[PDB]
Amino acid sequence: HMTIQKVHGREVLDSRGNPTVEVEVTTEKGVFRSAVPSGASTGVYEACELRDGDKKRYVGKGCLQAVKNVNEVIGPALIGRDELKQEELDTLMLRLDGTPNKGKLGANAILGCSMAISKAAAAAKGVPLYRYLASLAGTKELRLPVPCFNVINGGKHAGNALPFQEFMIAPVKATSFSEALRMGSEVYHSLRGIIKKKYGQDAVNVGDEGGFAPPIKDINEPLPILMEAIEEAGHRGKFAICMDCAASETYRETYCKWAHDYPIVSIEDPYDQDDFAGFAGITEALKGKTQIVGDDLTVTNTERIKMAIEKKACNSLLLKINQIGTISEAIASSKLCMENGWSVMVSHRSGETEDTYIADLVVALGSGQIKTGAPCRGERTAKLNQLLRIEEELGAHAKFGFPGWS
């Protein structure tokens, strides 16, 4: 009677206006709803995102097939099953699909089911999602993440001269999540001021993740601009910088000069996705100052991660749940990486929804790191606000931040 009563999928819109999959699992504890995020990326090592390719609906981007797979294949298999058995049910769905890349059912059919199950299970246990996921991960200490706010784009993400994809600011010396979020917002607002004054009113329109694409011609206005923003808002010394080079899109000393001159604590994809040797060199070169994050390198792929660990190619995992497509697998990859000395930065996609799962997930992993947007656009602020709520439930002795950056 305490088991799964109904499983239903539907198409919804993501924050770019493209369809994605949302899944509701219904038990006697209520209706538990989860939506799947989406990137513009592909991705030979990513789990399969299934699109319709009907040029008459959403120019080939419909998710009716993925939704049908939920409604007619996974759903029927889940009815009457005990939602508490996460591993068992995720493994079930892996075996239902039967392919190494989730190419049959679609990772975007399976993931919504995986997430909504875990929410129904947390409710059945009488604890919030983050607590339930922490039990699943064996996490000894919960913690609120320092948020890494996307603030200047960025290569393929802007029409400007800049070769690298993202410049983030991170309130690492904040002592609480509440404080971290207000600091991030305050610097984001002075940055907007600085950009408006230099480049004009239109220059403060925002990219997909809520950050700006100012017309920077000077490939090093951006880092000084970010320091200026941090000063003006009043938080000198309280912030670090995180970069995403997405260097594949362009394909070491330069990286040393920026880290030495600025407080850069993190650089994601500094080299091409197959330049394991170059990755390894920069990881060694900046060890203990600047962490190196695998994204296009690792693609939340189990064998790519095992590779990276073995070759010491990076020391931080970017965790995109939709890239692997089950919660049991995502947690396993987080645990594995942490066991080998790595940090984990939980991540949004460019195509996000009002869903807030990654807020509870980053807390539950206790990783101290989340990349979920600028403090702007509701598909980013939904996460940041969920983190405020989690912090409030945990009370004043709740741990904040990434120990290495504090």
- For a second copy, the binding residues (CB under 8 A) are 10-18, 22, 30, 56-59, 158-160, 181-182, 185-186, 188-189, 200-202, 205-207, 212-213, 215, 234, 352-354, 356, 374-382, 384-385, 388-389, 392
Q: Which is nearer to Zn ion, 40 or 161 (CB)?
A: 40
* Residue 97 interaction partner, one of Zn ion, a second copy, none, beta carbon < 5-8 Å per kind: none
Q: How far is CA 284 from CA 288, 289, 307, in A?
A: 9, 10, 16
* Residue 388 interaction partner, one of Zn ion, a second copy, none, beta carbon < 5-8 Å per kind: a second copy
41 is in an annotated binding site: yes
Alpha helices in 246-341 (DSSP H): 253-261, 276-285, 302-310, 321-324, 327-339
* Residue 244 interaction partner, one of Zn ion, a second copy, none, beta carbon < 5-8 Å per kind: Zn ion
Alpha carbons 282 and 252: distance in angstroms, whole number: 6
Alpha carbons 95 and 109: distance in angstroms, whole number: 14
* Residue 295 interaction partner, one of a second copy, Zn ion, none, beta carbon < 5-8 Å per kind: Zn ion
**CB-CB contact of 192 with 212 (8 Å):** yes
Known active-site residue 379: no
Question: Under the criterion CB under 5 A, does residue 90 sit at the interface with Zn ion?
Answer: no
* Residue 273 interaction partner, one of Zn ion, a second copy, none, beta carbon < 5-8 Å per kind: none
320 is in an annotated binding site: yes
* Residue 275 interaction partner, one of Zn ion, a second copy, none, beta carbon < 5-8 Å per kind: none
Alpha carbons 380 and 389: distance in angstroms, whole number: 15
Q: Is residue 76 packed enough to be buried (19+ CB in 10 Å), middle (13-18) or exposed (0-12)?
A: exposed
Alpha carbons 330 and 55: distance in angstroms, whole number: 33
Question: Under the criterion CB under 5 A, does residue 295 sit at the interface with Zn ion?
Answer: yes
Q: Which is nearer to a second copy, 160 or 273 (CB)?
A: 160
Q: Which is nearer to a second copy, 102 or 238 (CB)?
A: 238
Q: What angle do CA 402, 344, 174 make, to 5 degrees?
A: 20
Q: Which of 209, 221, 329, 379 is catalytic?
A: 209
350 is in an annotated binding site: yes
Alpha carbons 232 and 230: distance in angstroms, whole number: 6
Query: How near is the Cβ of 373 to a second copy at its closest, in Å?
Result: 9
Is 8 in a helix, a strand, or coil? strand
235 is in an annotated binding site: no
Q: Which of 61, 238, 320, 383 is catalytic?
A: 320
Q: Which is nearer to Zn ion, 120 or 242 (CB)?
A: 242
Known active-site residue 320: yes
Phi, psi for 332 (deg, rounded to 5): -55, -45
59: which 2 tokens?
A: 């120019």
Half-sphere exposure (Cβ direction) of 54: Cα atoms closer than 13 Å: 9
Q: Binders of Zn ion among 33-52, rule CB under 5 A?
A: 40
Q: Binders of Zn ion among 114-143, rule CB under 5 A?
A: none
Query: How near is the Cβ of 214 to Zn ion at its closest, in Å?
Result: 18
Query: How near is the Cβ of 296 to Zn ion at its closest, in Å?
Result: 6
Phi, psi for 109 (deg, rounded to 5): -90, -45
Q: Which is nearer to a second copy, 11 or 249 (CB)?
A: 11
- Minimal CB distance residue for Zn ion: 295
- The DSSP code sequence of 192-231 is HHHHHHHH-GGGG-B-TTS-B-----STTSHHHHHHHHHH
Beta bridge partners of 19: 13
Q: Binders of Zn ion among 236-265, rule CB under 5 A?
A: 244
Half-sphere exposure (Cβ direction) of 144: Cα atoms closer than 13 Å: 29
Is 360 in a helix, a strand, or coil? helix
Cis peptide before 154 (omega within 30 of 0): yes
28 is in an annotated binding site: yes
* Residues tagged active-site: 209, 320
Binding annotation for Mg(2+)? 244, 268, 295
Binding annotation for substrate? 157, 166, 268, 295, 347-350, 371
Binding annotation? 28, 40-41, 157, 166, 244, 268-269, 295-296, 320, 347-350, 371
Residues found near Zn ion in the complex (CB under 5 A):
40, 244, 268, 295
Binding annotation for Zn(2+)? 28, 41, 157, 244, 268-269, 295-296
